[PDB]
Amino acid sequence: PVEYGIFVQRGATYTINAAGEFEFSGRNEKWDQALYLSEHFPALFSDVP
Amino acid sequence: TVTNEFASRFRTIVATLANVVNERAVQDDMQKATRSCTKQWLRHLETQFD
Amino acid sequence: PVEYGIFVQRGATYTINAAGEFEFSGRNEKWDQALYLSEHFPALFSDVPLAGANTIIAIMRLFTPQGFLRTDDLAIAANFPRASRNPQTYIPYTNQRGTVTNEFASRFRTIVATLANVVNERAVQDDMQKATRSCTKQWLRHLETQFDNIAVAHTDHLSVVYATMSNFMLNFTNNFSGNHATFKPDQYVITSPEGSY
Amino acid sequence: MWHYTSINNDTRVALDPKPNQIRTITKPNTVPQLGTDYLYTFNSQRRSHTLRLLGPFQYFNFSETDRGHPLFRLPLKYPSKAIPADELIDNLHSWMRSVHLLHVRSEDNTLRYNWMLGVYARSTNYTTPVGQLVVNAPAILNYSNPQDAFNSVFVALGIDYID
Amino acid sequence: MWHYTSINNDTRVALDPKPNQIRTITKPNTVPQLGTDYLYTFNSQRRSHTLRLLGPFQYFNFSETDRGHPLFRLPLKYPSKAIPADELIDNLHSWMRSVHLLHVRSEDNTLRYNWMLGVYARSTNYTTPVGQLVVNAPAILNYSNPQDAFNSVFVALGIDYIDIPITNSNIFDDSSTPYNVRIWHAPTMTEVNHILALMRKSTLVSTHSSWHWNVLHTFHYRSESDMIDHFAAKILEDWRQKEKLDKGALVEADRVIQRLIPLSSSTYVQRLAAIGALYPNEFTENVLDLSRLSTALLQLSDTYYQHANDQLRRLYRRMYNDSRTLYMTQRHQELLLAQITADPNILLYPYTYIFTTIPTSMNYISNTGQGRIKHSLTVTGATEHDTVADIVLGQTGEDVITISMVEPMSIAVEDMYGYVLDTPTRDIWPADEQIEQKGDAVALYDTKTSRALGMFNNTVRIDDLLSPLLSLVYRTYIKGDTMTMTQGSLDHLTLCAAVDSDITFVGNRMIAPLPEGYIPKPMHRNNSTMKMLSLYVALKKLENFATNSYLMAPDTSIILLGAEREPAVNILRRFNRNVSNVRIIGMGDRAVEPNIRVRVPFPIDKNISADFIICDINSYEDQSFESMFSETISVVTTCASAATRALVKINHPSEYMINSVIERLSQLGGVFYHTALLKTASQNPYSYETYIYITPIAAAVRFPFYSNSAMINRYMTAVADDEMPIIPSIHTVIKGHSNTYSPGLFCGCVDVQSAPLALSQLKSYCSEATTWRVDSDDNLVNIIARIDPARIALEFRTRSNTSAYHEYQRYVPNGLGFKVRKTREFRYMHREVTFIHKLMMYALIREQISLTENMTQVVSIGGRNLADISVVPLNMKYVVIDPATRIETLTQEKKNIEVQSRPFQFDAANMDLENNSIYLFIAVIMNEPNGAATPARMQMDKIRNVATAMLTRTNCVAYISFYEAGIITRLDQSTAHKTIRVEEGRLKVANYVPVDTLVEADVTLMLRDIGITHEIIRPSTPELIDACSNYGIRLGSTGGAVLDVFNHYSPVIKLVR
Amino acid sequence: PMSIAVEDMYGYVLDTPTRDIWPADEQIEQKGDAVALYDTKTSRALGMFNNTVRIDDLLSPLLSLVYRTYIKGDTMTMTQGSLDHLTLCAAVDSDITFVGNRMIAPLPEGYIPKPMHRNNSTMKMLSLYVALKKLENFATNSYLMAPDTSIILLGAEREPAVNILRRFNRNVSNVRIIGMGDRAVEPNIRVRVPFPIDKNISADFIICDINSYEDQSFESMFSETISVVTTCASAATRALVKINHPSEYMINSVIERLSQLGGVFYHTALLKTASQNPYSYETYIYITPIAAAVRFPFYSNSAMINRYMTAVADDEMPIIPSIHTV
């Protein structure tokens, strides 16, 4: 629960900017596949510590 | 829980009613057998509720 | 109900910290035998005194074993395999020859006296008829006489069977230190660096 | 003497112990004392028995099991004289020793136990979802930023509030 | 004192009785006694029952039949009171008589019974083979050579060993035994070697360096925890023993090294045994909490290795791996050589390693009892810190420590009733002066007083200041502890203020005990209560001043005024209950019965009258100055006409207001009234409101009018402040050597390892810093530390940053304190009035020195402990000239101080004063350097010589503080004397010899004949607020009364060039 | 164990200075003898006796009996400020209230206060407090502080003496009884010699019991104890500071230091209390300014000094009491 609250506080998703850096949403939002074609990525798979 | 709190509350209720029925029976000089029988019945209720 | 309230509020189980103090779970929960291999112990068997639950603790002291921790001498002279660095078995009861009275049996008389005053206190709580109470007592006394009969056969005969059997070649593990409060079996595993142990 | 001057600080936060002190906040060893651990008054001309606890216990939701303790049956042993201090102290000590809030002691000096939620989880025997959170993650009660102490629970459980 | 000296003897052998005494060792006849046969303690706060037996029975394995005895069921008859001694003694006697060890008495004088084995055979009912040996041959227990006592049993039975269980020394603790001893066959040294070699093959096993009965025996543990506890115990015993061997004492110990050797063990025990022979601990006489010893000793080890130089570290590792070896000092081995030469057949542990050189580690403080340490951090030390990282302090719970706003007063009961009074000084009141005073007063009332002043006035309420005291007088009464006090005494009055009930006396001194079952409620005093009581006392003492019983005369009346005065009336009434015919009336707005309610102006038809009057009426909060003027004038008129002995409050005691009061009374009565300006110690310390005593007298008053009075100055100088008042911060971060810190505290906590560092950084700001741990388990040291500005003035003169960091390292982890109980600390601590005065002076002089230009140096004369250093700005050089100050040259070099440890030469010719320098003779001229008081003429000689020496220098400035004579005449009138009091005419500051005082007119007279320019000056209110807010200090209750007078009559003389 | 009267342990003897001058030719001799003594250390037998015959153990049976008669209520009457009062305060760790001038308030039923835990130097510090009260007056019967006066004990682990003095003066208004020294716990402030330069202690009484550092150059201990004496002398009009190494040179140089400190000589004396360990050569030095110019300010061939000077390191290892059987 605690690691989860930390992670989700960082954001449930992220976008990559032109410089290549990750940019997390800061928000908990349920994923939809509608997003797969958008700029967003699930944040669980970012592999950013 | 190892123990069901609702059931345990019924055990306390029944303990109270038991000392109540008992206090009555001693007030009315009731025979020991019938008193033991009311108590066995109350205990049975406790097990059933549990 | 009240002694139980206190006791289980202390914790259903406990573990032993490196300081060796028992630390109780502080939580009601049923035991499962899975836990037997864990760091956890049932808390009834802690023998750690607790105010206001003395009756439970006493009824618990009745469970403490009457034997001793024999060394496996002959299995050592034989170089019989033994996992422990010092092999030992708990014989359930010592031999008792010289005495007019069998100490194991007498311990059963004390246990039974306790249970007797316990069952009695219950029967008066439940206004039970005198006849049935006298019958439970006669039954307990009978148990005492029976135990006094067989006690010599246990302490003075069966114990030696145990004491040989401790040295049988394949009885290789340590089973019990004789102290319920702090005994966990040593746990060996066959660990490959590749697959799971 | 015009301007208002004041130091603001959160008492409900200040009153909440660091996790290492939770094991001993019951004061298992020493006996409770008036004006410190607790305070009592028998109000005469009205025959009432006010026992208020002090320190962290001043905010404490009792378990029904706590209400099964003799300490609460105590006023019933009266009216009308004030309860003897010896019986009061022995009982209240026994009860105090009875509580065992779930926690996990840590080395960090920034942390404090979220006393309210852990007491509350004890109060419901950890049946409520916040309760079973408190069972499977006692660490969730420890916190440095006071606000995130609750946010971690609201996010772990997904809930909009806790009554 | 080099060599170890000791007598070795086997106690386990000495304790074993000769066979003839075994029949009577049970003491069949005589009853057992405490401190002889046994000892018992019921440990309170823990509800435990320790019964330890003494004599041979201290080592006794009980039979289960022995455990069937009532004596062991005894603790069960409790909790919680200690077991009655009669039942204890009867039972223990019965049990003792129950034992009957098998033996055969003989005539030979060499023999003794082998108590251990016979007791053990009893314990198993002689079922065990050693047991049946003891049955068929009791003689086998008797022995002359101690060793053969066991060898005879090992050979008769053929066994290689015997495992004897040991019981807990306490016999009421029926629980699993930690381990068991095991006697081995031995007897040659070789057999011992072999056994010990074979013991490496066993599991949890250890041995002492030598053995009782000279029979090798090893301990075998149930678990590593039990083993660790045994090791820690024995380590503490060897430490405690070698501590007295090093001190050269003869020691009767059984063996030279009391540490165990782990023949086979867990790693924790190896690290214990390793740390054990290092002997890290400093000698200590404090009681230890043994219950946690293991933890302590482990943590110590963990830190010892953690901050030891690489070679000592490796030495520790060597001992840690070669744990089977017994490490020992050369002197130990010398002792072993001696005891071997005496007894060649003695067996000693063979694998040992002698230290050619003892390790030179820092000794560790290691008190593990209760109590916070109160460090006083040194400014500098051997360690040279450079760019140390900021140390965050963790937040603490209220459970560990609470931070209340103001430290409650801790004065004597009588102390709160004292008052000081300022007499009028000027003989006339010219109208040209009146315009000035009326103007200053009007402007003051319009702009209001200082915001900081009123913040302190409202924060430091007197009621809360006196609460702990009054409540204690209440609490000792209700539990009946009080019983004797004089009627009319201050303790009587205070008892009346503590308790809301009538307080009858039976006889002149005894108080009537309260009827059983009846506990009176506390008296509910509002803030102004104690003050009114203090004024009642003030009137009783102004009436007589030889009084001891402050009690109304029969048939006399007093009438308190002001809002909500009811409690003071109920208290005065109950206090005077035994006096016949006393009227104690009350008035004022918002009054409840008994008090009559009225508003100012009093109704014109009304006609109050009494032998005493006490007005405490407040000024209306919003009205024109002329309005308050007519109002308080009318109040004073009413109070003066009503009673011969009025005491009326002046809320706005301007020179103009009070002098106009004198004018009003003068035109009212013709002859002037004998007015005085009283200030009681039950007033809120910062209150500028001051009472004015008023009485007709037959003598025509000379100098009726006030000017430049102390009580007046306290109000006049509280001008509305330039800047919003400072609020005491609680800093958490500890930056290293950073100047930026607002006044306040460092409350917080940090891991014990960072504790030496935190203390080392705190010293830059804090003079002293209390620290502790909650428990041996918790790793965080809590710290509270006031920020003292003086330390900031010292530590920031140069960029150097040094500390006694290693000395602080010596504390980890047990040396920093321990305390389970909650501690309360305060944003505003109490300090003595004289100290607050010195601070006000230092502020006055600091604020003066900052303004002046081109001053190369400040030279404080007689400034012990650099006391004046706060005054001097961080860049300017600071010279001290005092014989008493003691400094290493490197320290003055470190902080740009320049000490000259010679007495200052007050002879005018050789007094070498520099140009562009600021001399500081604060509080020094009155005393000779040795501390003896100088005659006042000598002080005048001092000031003469210093001004005459200043006559040639340019840009020179000097501040010569000196006591004024006027204070004496005031102190002779006043009853307050908590810290300032006359002694045959010389005022006595606390911890100082009373000193003769100078007359200011004579001082300015000689100063003007000398012709040097000069200015008499005193610290004012803004200086008070600056000192108090900056140091985190609140003024005392008595301090509030005495401070205005004490400060006004201790002028600084500012000579200048 | 000792079997003396209760008052007997509080007594002290004092040796006055005898010689009117301190010639430098003598100073070289004394400085030499003192240096050599400090370097070779004192007699091994001496220190064995000093460590074997601890005063705490010597007085234990007595203090424990005063404790035991109190808890069973046998005691009840004693003067406040009396030596029996003080010793009762040292026997028992609890406040001791009086009801009336002579009666002691009986302990509440069911409450038995624990024994006071004194370390070895406790009784000595109490003996020095009494020593100061008697040096102040010598006609005194009530050894009790005057109201509004302060005393400040120094040295390591002085806390019990402070708790005892405090509980003993509980009925006196406004008494500061401060404690200092290394390894101090609250109430006592902790400090190390030299005292921090910013620090400024002051009191009407001072009692230094600070130990010399165990391993330092003689000049080092010299500057240290000189600085200690300076601090104690400046702090209070009536100091009593321990000298661990009371050589003729050390003490006379102390007199020189005070003489250049205050101008006129202080009225020094060499006190030795009965609560000291009997073989201790450490001796206290009373120090006070007086209006009279001291004649014969300096010591020579003094008793307290001789006790130390003559404990030269011994020729032969000390004898150990045998228990002969044949």
Coordinates of N, CA and C in Angstrom, one line a residue, chain E residues 797 849 854-860 872-873 875-880 898 900 912-920 955 957:
Chain E
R797 N 33.1 35.5 15.9 CA 34.2 36.5 15.7 C 35.2 36.1 14.6
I849 N 27.4 51.1 21.4 CA 28.7 50.9 20.8 C 28.5 50.7 19.2
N854 N 34.9 54.5 14.4 CA 36.4 54.4 14.5 C 36.8 53.8 15.9
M855 N 36.1 52.8 16.4 CA 36.5 52.2 17.6 C 37.3 50.9 17.4
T856 N 38.6 51.0 17.6 CA 39.5 49.8 17.3 C 39.2 48.6 18.2
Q857 N 38.8 48.9 19.5 CA 38.7 47.8 20.4 C 37.8 48.0 21.6
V858 N 37.2 47.0 22.2 CA 36.4 47.1 23.4 C 37.2 46.4 24.5
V859 N 37.5 47.1 25.6 CA 38.2 46.5 26.7 C 37.4 46.4 27.9
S860 N 36.9 45.2 28.2 CA 36.1 44.9 29.4 C 37.0 44.6 30.6
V872 N 30.1 43.5 22.3 CA 31.1 43.9 21.3 C 30.9 43.2 19.9
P873 N 30.8 44.1 18.8 CA 30.5 43.7 17.5 C 31.6 42.7 16.9
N875 N 33.5 42.0 14.5 CA 34.8 42.4 13.8 C 35.8 43.0 14.7
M876 N 35.3 43.8 15.7 CA 36.2 44.6 16.6 C 37.0 43.7 17.6
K877 N 38.2 44.0 17.8 CA 39.0 43.2 18.8 C 38.5 43.5 20.2
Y878 N 38.5 42.4 21.0 CA 37.9 42.4 22.3 C 38.9 42.0 23.4
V879 N 39.4 43.0 24.2 CA 40.3 42.8 25.3 C 39.6 42.5 26.6
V880 N 40.1 41.5 27.3 CA 39.6 41.3 28.7 C 40.7 41.5 29.7
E898 N 41.6 38.9 23.5 CA 42.9 39.2 24.0 C 42.8 39.3 25.6
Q900 N 44.3 39.5 29.4 CA 45.5 39.9 30.2 C 45.2 39.6 31.6
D912 N 47.2 52.6 31.7 CA 47.5 52.9 30.3 C 46.2 52.7 29.4
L913 N 45.4 53.7 29.2 CA 44.3 53.7 28.4 C 44.6 54.0 26.9
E914 N 44.1 53.2 26.0 CA 44.3 53.5 24.5 C 43.3 54.5 24.0
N915 N 43.7 55.2 22.9 CA 42.8 56.0 22.1 C 41.9 55.1 21.3
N916 N 40.7 55.6 20.9 CA 39.8 54.8 20.1 C 39.4 53.5 20.7
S917 N 39.2 53.5 22.0 CA 38.8 52.2 22.8 C 37.6 52.4 23.6
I918 N 36.9 51.3 23.9 CA 35.7 51.4 24.7 C 35.8 50.5 25.9
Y919 N 36.2 51.1 27.0 CA 36.3 50.4 28.3 C 35.0 50.1 29.0
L920 N 34.9 49.0 29.6 CA 33.7 48.5 30.2 C 33.9 48.1 31.7
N955 N 38.7 60.2 21.6 CA 37.8 59.2 21.1 C 37.5 58.0 22.1
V957 N 35.9 56.0 25.3 CA 34.6 55.9 25.9 C 34.6 54.9 27.0

